[PDB]
Design a binder for this molecule. Structure first.
Ligand SMILES: CCCCCCCCCCCCCCCCCC(=O)OC[C@H](COP(=O)([O-])OCC(O)COP(=O)([O-])OC[C@@H](COC(=O)CCCCCCCCCCCCCCCCC)OC(=O)CCCCCCCCCCCCCCCCC)OC(=O)CCCCCCCCCCCCCCCCC
Ligand SMILES: CCCCCCCCCCCCCCCCCC(=O)OC[C@H](COP(=O)([O-])OC[C@H](O)COP(=O)([O-])OC[C@H](COC(=O)CCCCCCCCCCCCCCCCC)OC(=O)CCCCCCCCCCCCCCCCC)OC(=O)CCCCCCCCCCCCCCCCC
Ligand SMILES: CCCCCCCCCCCCCCCCCC(=O)OC[C@H](COP(=O)([O-])OCC[N+](C)(C)C)OC(=O)CCCCCCCCCCCCCCCCC
Ligand SMILES: CCCCCCCCCCCCCCCCCC(=O)OC[C@H](COP(=O)([O-])OCC[N+](C)(C)C)OC(=O)CCCCCCCCCCCCCCCCC
Ligand SMILES: CCCCCCCCCCCCCCCCCC(=O)OC[C@H](COP(=O)(O)OCCN)OC(=O)CCCCCCCCCCCCCCCCC
Ligand SMILES: CCCCCCCCCCCCCCCCCC(=O)OC[C@H](COP(=O)(O)OCCN)OC(=O)CCCCCCCCCCCCCCCCC
Ligand SMILES: CCCCCCCCCCCCCCCCCC(=O)OC[C@H](COP(=O)(O)OCCN)OC(=O)CCCCCCCCCCCCCCCCC
Ligand SMILES: C=C(C)[C@H]1Cc2c(ccc3c2O[C@@H]2COc4cc(OC)c(OC)cc4[C@@H]2C3=O)O1
Ligand SMILES: C=C(C)[C@H]1Cc2c(ccc3c2O[C@H]2COc4cc(OC)c(OC)cc4[C@@H]2C3=O)O1
Lengths: 80, 98, 314, 167, 347, 96, 171, 105
């Protein structure tokens, strides 16, 4: 497992670097803890208007103002 | 309807009649075929951009890619004819009449 | 007022290309333990002027051409494409500020092979046509790695905008996270412009040996109008300078110095090595640059996702 | 005159196809198709399809017609041509005279004769090109499309290497 | 050709047909036809001789022109409907262009002029693929757009295909051209009953595929491409002459064989719809292809022939050729008429 | 360094988009009054032009529905000069 | 069909916010903070009615509350706001990031003289709820009656009466 | 044949690019989103034969949103009568349609 690897690193180091970088690019997003935050930032980016809801009477988790404490927050992004 | 669509379809029909009955170089037939593809690209692009139908914006690229691959395939056939007769004259392609 | 901006773009391009010949001959002279031109002007400064006037009053061939019209269209397309590559270049502000300037420059540089192909058509010499086909296959080979390296870097840019690429490198040069891309990019731009060790138009007779001094001076200068541009493009792409919006000439002096050093680096490469054999640079592209470029394209796809560093879309 | 510029390009586009479907040679046929690709690309760019216009320049002209001119160089070293050219040109200019004197025409479909600046939309799209985000959707919404296209291109490589071998 | 690469390319042919069969979006229909053409081009160039290159170039040009007309039809559908569902079309111009394009992909008249040539230039297995598997996808698209198909166009194409497939095979001594004009005639028989009952179209398609598969499998088993080499079969293997006898009698439509099954049902589904003259002259023309089948088996299959001395060497060796499904396909191509109400499984 | 700076740039992009969002109701109100202004002006000029034509209903909807349809470009800028037409139809496309 | 109803020109007259885009962009965070309620009543009415003719008066309230937003800047903090939107106005992309000290002066003077807290990262993009008194549109698309669906299949499945009934096949 | 593998396996291969009313990136509406939605909700489940005759008005509204033939015909009529009254001289353009009024917002 190290004789063939040293042999291909002595003969074809271009392809060894190629397969190694490709293998890292495949497997490493499944091991990184920051891959969750990529998804989280790309859904926190407001391309559209936050269309308001008609207050039916019972929506406690919806704020009545942007500065209200309920709703989604981005303190995880301001800290990181 | 739109007036530019008439010109793009007329271009398509011009290159379609250029493909059909001339009996000339094979490369000229492939050029007429890719002119047909070009007019299809322009027409699909103007319709999809006109209607603001966002998910079909990737459609003409698909229409490009496949057909350009198709074009590559045609050239290889031509090259095999160009490795058989020395020319791409389509009247050399008459072995299979009998 | 916009026409004044177009002229102050394109006339100093031709002047810089003219004096690049002097810089080439002088820097190649001192690296070869000799001098370059110092007789014709003071310190050789009138050598490109005398050379351009000398070429413009030689007799052209006007040979038996397979096409007269493409013999005319090859210098016109060469100069027109060589001048239109400069119009989205942000230094620090571009002439044409477009959202897709990178893809524009990629497409227009892909259009430059028709000059080589039509110049091989227009000469009746079949060996000049062979050399033109080898030059075209060289250029379309290295356009592949240009496209993929450029895509991998624009995955860190966030857009196809060339002026965004200044905002991208406000903290660090983009040669630090992308130096393998930068070195394959630099050698690939060297192979785009038919520049040594990748030139195959001086020895085994090139595609433009049919042209003599009327169109040739134009072809040549269009060719060097690409070279500076590519280095300027490399300067925008991997060596992004500081931009103060209240003093834009800080960026203009900084990128100008870096682009001069990179064009001199082209001159210093061609004076240091022998040429490739033709299949050796085909071996260099298809078997050495292309697997690494695909691997690093996978790495620069997955890397901003795994570091939570996806750049902004706008 | 500037309001009809898309229309003007379209006329050249039609002319460009009659430029090469008359077929004096695959050389000049390729030249006419390259000029036609440029002007139809200008048509595409004038509706806001900037990425699709640069796909015409990068892939159709810069990628594929290069290979057509290359094969025309390497493999392929009047009256009918000029007659078909002037015939198609007379047909197209009589169509232009009809649709400009009438502002209405019917060859196959019914076509308006005003400019196509009227048929646009008056809104905005915020901080993105809609066409750019629709092409970006190829990787998020277009999974099966990417699969079949990549398999077709891999098969295309395999098929070219099969039939060009001759063994 | 490398057998792994051959498996991959045949799976790509099958995959393109499957993508045309299952997809709801017209672009994926077009993609499946592009995939199918791009994959089938090496199957025709398996032996690498100039006749196969001519045949593949002609097939490429016809299927490429058909694919461009198909995409123009899809694009006019997008103009006049703003959508992409593979269902009925929303413009008679798109209907005409897509019917023309599918007629070019099937090889129906007046676009029949490649089917006898291409089938002649390619081997028997690739001709089997061309005349059986390449019919499945355009018949599926015609099956799904039949609310928009113009009746006069589809019947003109159908009867023109039946007449040209009838009067084109009378002159033929090559077996592949006989199968190709038989293909054109059977596609006319499938598309004339399409707007009346599409289940009988599917019945004709399956019975045709069985009989054509039987004929090409017997051709590969005997290595005969001409009439005269087919006549030299009784002195080598006598049962193979019996099987090409019964299968060619079935393809013309003799009772009580199974190839009488579809077209009789087709006549049975055209008189319900008060069309009497059209299936009458349609089967009049089918009597001409049955008639040259009866010359091509009476004069040159039954009554035994002058042989050659080298055939007496070939008596000492049995057939090691893999005659895959040949007895099953021969039983199904002849003895299936008592199970004629099996057609309801295709509803 | 590119990690820290692209995270900073995403925060700055969210700030720009929220400035846009906060301005969007005022822009929506002005845009609504803009298009109703242009339609009312075109309606009055149609009422003073289209009296010679018999059988003409001024302001007649071409749609069978009674739902509000977003005004087309040639509906709004149909009776104005070619400079404003060219601006509103190719300004963003032709801008630099 | 019918005549499309349009409001008169007096129904469209309101005092316009005649300030530049860099002026609007400079005060945009405090605008979204302080002018929340009429803007959200308008955008709720605008996505619900799907018709701008039914959204004029709420829009006027927007143009009533925006002007009172700027007058309240002009009475108190005209000079730091002017120094701030001038710096916003210099930039071709109108960067907030080039203008942080002028932003700090404007935010300081606004918090001192008006008590306004600038919204944080992630607040103005929230989906908020709006309490209005106007009724819910029962048919915002003006859709007519949908066609009645075809009758579904019911009844237990019996065998075929004497089989296929195909000419002589008794099964 | 239409072997509906996508519904049998419950997978979404290509239903998403099929209509303009489907889920778009960033909630971008098409220009005829409402018309196509109305026509699709009319013609749903009733079959194509009943849809061609019972959903004619929605389909005409949607086709006229797509092509704008009636709107361009009306603009042609108004612009042609306006050109005739300009040539005769019985009409003059107002200052808000000649470009002399410094637009509203
Ligand atoms: C449903 C549709 C099914 C369609 C047919 C599927 C199989 C054929 C297609 C694939 C193929 O070629 O396989 C080889 C193929 C043999 O084809 P062949 O080479 O032409 O046969 C010539 C000799 O038999 C070659 O003989 P051999 O010396 O190589 O060895 C004998 C061989 C050895 O057998 C084995 O080894 C089999 C046991 C192992 C199987 C694999 C286990 C793992 O046994 C046989 O071949 C016996 C005959 C098998 C039956 C063939 C026909 C099948 C029925 C077709 C449909 C009929 C429909 C009528 C409808 C009428 C009304 C409309 O089949 C087999 O070997 C096994 C067949 C199993 C049938 C299963 C039926 C139920 C399916 C559910
Ligand atoms: C408690 C639980 C357990 C109880 C167990 C009870 C049973 C114990 C015994 C087990 C064995 C049972 C056998 C099957 C049941 C009886 C079948 C029967 O007689 O059907 C009468 C059937 C009609 O008579 P039926 O009075 O209406 O029905 C009386 C029964 O109730 C018949 O029933 P059905 O009324 O329901 O009939 C239904 C319907 C009745 O039919 C109809 O409604 C009319 C449609 C019939 C088809 C017409 C096609 C005409 C064009 C094609 C002609 C082909 C060429 C002729 C043959 C050449 C050689 C292949 O059938 C069909 O449509 C199916 C097609 C005919 C299949 C007949 C069975 C064949 C099995 C053996 C095959 C060997 C070759 C036979 C002849 C092949 C030609 C048919 O007769 C015919 O159609 C004529 C053919 C002769 C019948 C086959 C006799 C089977 C045994 C043959 C032994 C000798 C073999 C010699 C070597 C091979 C030949 C070279
Ligand atoms: C843009 C600014 C400037 C950029 C730098 C360029 C300036 C200096 C230029 C010097 C003169 C060059 C003249 C042209 C030379 C052309 C010939 C040449 O060099 O060919 C290239 C040669 C080709 O090989 P070769 O020609 O030497 O050998 C023959 C080939 N074999 C061996 C197959 C027989 O090398 C390359 O292709 C390398 C390209 C860059 C590689 C980048 C590697 C990145 C490292 C990743 C990590 C690796 C560690 C292991 C894994 C770790 C994982 C965590
Ligand atoms: C080899 C195959 C590699 C890719 C397999 C699918 C990967 C994947 O996650 O696809 C999800 C995607 C999308 O699913 P999703 O999970 O993103 O769904 C979320 C919904 N949207 C897309 C609207 C945001 O595709 C599918 O689920 C179905 C289409 C492809 C199914 C696999 C076909 C394989 C064919 C092999 C021959
Ligand atoms: C799973 C990860 C992702 C994999 C997919 C992505 C790959 C990215 C790079 C793309 C490369 C494309 C072309 C690759 C061709 C490979 C086959 C090959 O080159 O074989 C021939 C070669 C002998 O060379 P020869 O035939 O003589 O060619 C002329 C040069 N002398 O023989 C060789 O060079 C031997 C090659 C095999 C041994 C390479 C081992 C590299 C190990 C690196 C560390 C581990 C990486 C993890 C993944 C495992 C990779 C094996
Ligand atoms: C033998 C024939 C002669 C050969 C020599 C001469 C031709 C070759 C050299 C010239 C090549 C011309 C290329 C012109 C188009 C380049 C692509 C392009 O325009 O991209 C830039 C830009 C896209 O970016 P974006 O920011 O989205 O646009 C502004 C929107 N905010 O888009 C824009 O900014 C859009 C601006 C409006 C539309 C521009 C259309 C230009 C004219 C059409 C092409 C004319 C040339 C035709 C021939 C091409 C080559 C064959
Ligand atoms: C509603 C529609 C849904 C779908 C329904 C199903 C449709 C089925 C259509 C079947 C089409 C089959 C086409 C041929 C088989 C495909 C692969 C192939 O070509 O195999 C032949 C193979 C080639 O091997 P090779 O070495 O190249 O041979 C040259 C000779 N030295 O090997 C040989 O040449 C060996 C010789 C014998 C080959 C006989 C193959 C018979 C295949 C057809 C079986 C009958 C059809 C299936 C049942 C009816 C379905 C409708
Ligand atoms: C553009 C202007 C102003 C003039 C100057 C000029 C030309 C045209 C062509 C050339 C040129 O300058 C130099 C001259 O000398 C060498 C000598 C070389 O090698 C000794 C060499 O090798 C590539 C290249 C060259 C240039 C060359 O070709 O027009
Ligand atoms: C040469 C070909 C293609 C055909 C035509 C033909 C044969 C073989 C044999 C004969 C034949 O012609 C027929 C003509 O008329 C009847 C009519 C008959 O019955 C109606 C009848 O019954 C056995 C027999 C006959 C001839 C007969 O023996 O092969």
């Amino acid at each position: 497992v190290a004789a063939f690897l040293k042999n291909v690193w002595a003969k074809e180091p271009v392809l060894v670097a190629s397969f190694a970088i490709a293998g890292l690019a495949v497997i490493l997003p499944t091991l990184s803890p920051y891959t969750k935050y990529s998804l989280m930032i790309n859904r926190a980016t407001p391309y559209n208007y936050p269309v308001p809801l008609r207050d039916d009477g019972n929506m406690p988790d919806v704020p009545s103002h942007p500065q209200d404490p309920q709703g989604p927050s981005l303190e995880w992004l301001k800290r990181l | 309807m739109s007036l530019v669509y008439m010109n793009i379809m007329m271009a398509f029909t011009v290159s379609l009649t250029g493909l059909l009955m001339y009996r000339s170089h094979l490369m000229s037939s492939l050029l007429c075929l890719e002119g047909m593809m070009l007019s299809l690209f322009i027409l699909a692009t103007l319709m999809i951009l006109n209607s603001h139908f966002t998910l079909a914006s990737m459609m003409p690229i698909i229409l490009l890619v496949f057909a350009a691959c198709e074009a590559a395939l045609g050239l290889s056939l031509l090259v095999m004819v160009s490795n058989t007769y020395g020319t791409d004259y389509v009247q050399n392609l008459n072995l299979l009449q009998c | 007022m916009f026409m004044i901006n177009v002229l102050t773009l394109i006339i100093p391009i031709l002047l810089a290309v003219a004096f690049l010949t002097l810089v080439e001959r002088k820097v190649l002279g001192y690296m070869q333990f000799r001098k370059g031109p110092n007789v014709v002007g003071p310190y050789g400064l009138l050598q490109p002027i005398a050379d351009a006037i000398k070429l413009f009053i030689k007799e052209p061939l006007r040979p038996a051409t397979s096409s007269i019209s493409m013999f005319i269209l090859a210098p016109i397309l060469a100069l027109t494409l060589a001048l239109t590559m400069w119009i989205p270049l942000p230094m620090p502000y571009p002439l044409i500020n477009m959202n897709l300037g990178v893809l524009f420059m990629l497409a227009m540089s892909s259009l430059a092979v028709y000059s080589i192909l039509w110049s091989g058509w227009a000469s009746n010499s079949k060996y000049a046509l062979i050399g033109a086909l080898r030059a075209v296959a060289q250029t379309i080979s290295y356009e592949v790695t240009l496209a993929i390296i450029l895509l991998s870097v624009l995955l860190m840019n966030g857009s196809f905008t060339l002026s965004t690429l200044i905002i991208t490198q406000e903290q660090v040069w983009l040669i630090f996270p992308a130096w393998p891309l930068a070195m394959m990019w630099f050698i690939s731009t060297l192979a785009e412009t038919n520049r040594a060790p990748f030139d195959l138009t001086e020895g085994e007779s090139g595609f433009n040996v049919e042209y003599a001094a009327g169109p040739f001076a134009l072809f040549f200068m269009a060719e060097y109008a690409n070279i500076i541009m590519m280095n300027i493009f490399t300067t925008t792409l991997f060596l992004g300078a500081f931009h103060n919006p209240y003093m834009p000439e800080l960026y203009t002096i900084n990128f100008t110095i870096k682009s001069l050093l990179l064009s001199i680096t082209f001159l210093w490469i061609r004076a240091s090595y022998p040429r490739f054999r033709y299949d050796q640079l085909m071996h260099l592209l298809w078997k050495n640059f292309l697997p690494l470029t695909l691997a690093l394209c996978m790495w620069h796809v997955s890397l901003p996702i795994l570091l939570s560093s996806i750049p902004p879309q706008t | 005159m500037m309001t009809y510029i898309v229309f003007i390009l379209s006329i050249i586009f039609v002319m460009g196809f009659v430029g090469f479907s008359s077929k004096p040679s695959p050389i000049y046929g390729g030249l006419g198709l390259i000029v036609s690709g440029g002007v139809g690309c200008g048509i595409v760019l004038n509706f806001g399809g900037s990425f699709l216009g640069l796909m015409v320049f990068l892939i159709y002209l810069g990628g594929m017609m290069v290979v057509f001119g290359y094969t025309t160089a390497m493999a392929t070293e009047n009256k009918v041509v000029l007659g078909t050219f002037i015939t198609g040109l007379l047909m197209e200019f009589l169509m232009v005279y009809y649709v400009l004197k009438d502002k209405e025409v019917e060859i196959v479909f019914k076509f308006n004769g005003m400019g196509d600046w009227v048929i646009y939309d008056t809104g905005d799209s915020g901080f993105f090109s809609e066409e750019a985000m629709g092409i970006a959707a190829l990787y998020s919404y277009g999974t099966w499309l990417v699969i079949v296209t990549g398999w077709s291109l891999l098969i295309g490589v395999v098929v070219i290497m099969e039939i060009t071998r001759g063994n | 050709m490398n057998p792994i690469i051959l498996i991959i390319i045949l799976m790509t042919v099958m995959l393109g047909t499957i993508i045309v069969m299952i997809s709801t979006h017209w672009l994926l229909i077009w993609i499946g036809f592009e995939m199918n053409m791009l994959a089938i081009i090496p199957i025709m160039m398996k032996k690498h001789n100039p006749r196969a290159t001519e045949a593949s170039t002609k097939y490429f040009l016809t299927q490429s022109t058909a694919s461009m007309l198909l995409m123009m039809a899809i694009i006019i559908n997008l103009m006049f409907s703003g959508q992409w569902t593979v269902m009925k079309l929303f413009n008679p111009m798109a209907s005409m262009l897509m019917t023309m394009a599918l007629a070019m992909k099937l090889g129906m008249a007046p676009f029949h002029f490649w089917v006898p040539e291409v089938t002649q230039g390619i081997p028997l297995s690739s001709g089997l693929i061309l005349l059986t598997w390449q019919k499945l996808a355009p018949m599926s698209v015609l099956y799904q757009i039949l609310p928009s198909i113009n009746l006069d166009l589809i019947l003109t194409l159908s009867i023109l295909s039946i007449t040209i497939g009838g009067w084109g095979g009378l002159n033929q001594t090559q077996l592949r051209k006989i199968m190709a004009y038989s293909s054109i005639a059977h596609m006319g028989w499938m598309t004339a009953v399409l707007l009346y009952n599409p289940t009988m179209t599917l019945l004709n398609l399956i019975i045709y595929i069985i009989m054509t598969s039987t004929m090409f499998t017997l051709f590969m088993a005997n290595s005969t491409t001409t009439t005269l080499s087919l006549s030299h079969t009784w002195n080598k293997a006598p049962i193979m002459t019996i099987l090409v006898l019964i299968t060619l009698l079935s393809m013309g439509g003799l009772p009580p064989l199974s190839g009488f099954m579809p077209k009789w049902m087709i006549i049975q589904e055209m008189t319900k719809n008060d069309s009497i003259i059209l299936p009458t002259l349609m089967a009049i023309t089918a009597l001409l292809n049955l008639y040259f089948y009866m010359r091509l088996t009476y004069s040159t299959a039954l009554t035994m022939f002058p042989s050659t001395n080298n055939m007496k060497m070939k008596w000492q060796f049995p057939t090691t050729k893999r005659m895959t499904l040949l007895p099953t396909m021969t039983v199904l191509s002849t003895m299936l008429l008592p199970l004629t109400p099996i057609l309801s499984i295709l509803e | 360094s590119m990690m820290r700076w692209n995270r900073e740039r995403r925060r700055l992009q969210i700030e720009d988009f929220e400035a846009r969002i906060a301005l969007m109701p005022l822009l929506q109100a002005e845009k609504d009054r803009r298009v109703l202004q242009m339609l009312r002006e075109n309606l009055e000029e149609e009422a003073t032009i289209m009296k010679d034509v018999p059988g003409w209903k001024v302001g007649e909807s071409v749609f069978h529905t009674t739902r509000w349809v977003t005004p087309m470009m040639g509906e709004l800028y149909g009776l104005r000069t070619g400079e404003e037409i060219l601006s509103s139809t190719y300004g963003f496309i032709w801008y630099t | 069909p019918g005549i499309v109803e349009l409001p008169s020109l007096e129904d469209l007259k309101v005092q316009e916010v005649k300030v530049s885009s860099s002026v609007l962009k400079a005060a945009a965070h405090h605008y979204g903070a302080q002018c929340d309620k009429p803007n959200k009543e308008f955008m709720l009415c605008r996505w619900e009615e799907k018709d701008p003719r039914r959204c004029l008066e709420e829009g006027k309230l927007v143009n009533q509350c925006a002007l009172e937003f700027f007058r309240q800047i002009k009475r108190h903090c005209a000079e730091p706001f002017t120094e701030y939107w001038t710096c916003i106005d210099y930039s071709g992309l109108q960067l907030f990031r080039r203008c942080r000290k002028e932003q700090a002066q404007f935010d300081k003077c606004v918090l001192d003289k008006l008590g306004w807290v600038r919204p944080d990262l992630g607040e103005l993009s929230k989906v908020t709820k709006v309490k209005t008194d106007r009724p819910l549109p029962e048919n915002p698309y003006h859709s007519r009656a949908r066609p009645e669906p075809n009758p579904e299949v019911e009844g237990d499945l019996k065998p075929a009466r004497h089989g296929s009934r195909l000419f002589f096949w008794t099964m | 044949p239409f072997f509906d593998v996508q519904k049998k396996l419950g997978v979404d291969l290509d239903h998403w690019m099929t209509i303009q009313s489907a889920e778009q990136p960033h909630r971008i509406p098409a220009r005829c989103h409402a018309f196509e939605k109305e026509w699709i909700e009319c013609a749903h489940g009733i079959g194509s034969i009943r849809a061609e005759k019972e959903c004619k008005i929605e389909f005409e509204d949607f086709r006229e949103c797509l092509l704008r033939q009636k709107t361009m015909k009306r603009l042609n009529a108004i612009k042609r009568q306006r050109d005739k009254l300009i040539k005769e001289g019985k009409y003059t353009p107002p200052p808000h349609h000649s470009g002399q009024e410094d637009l509203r917002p």
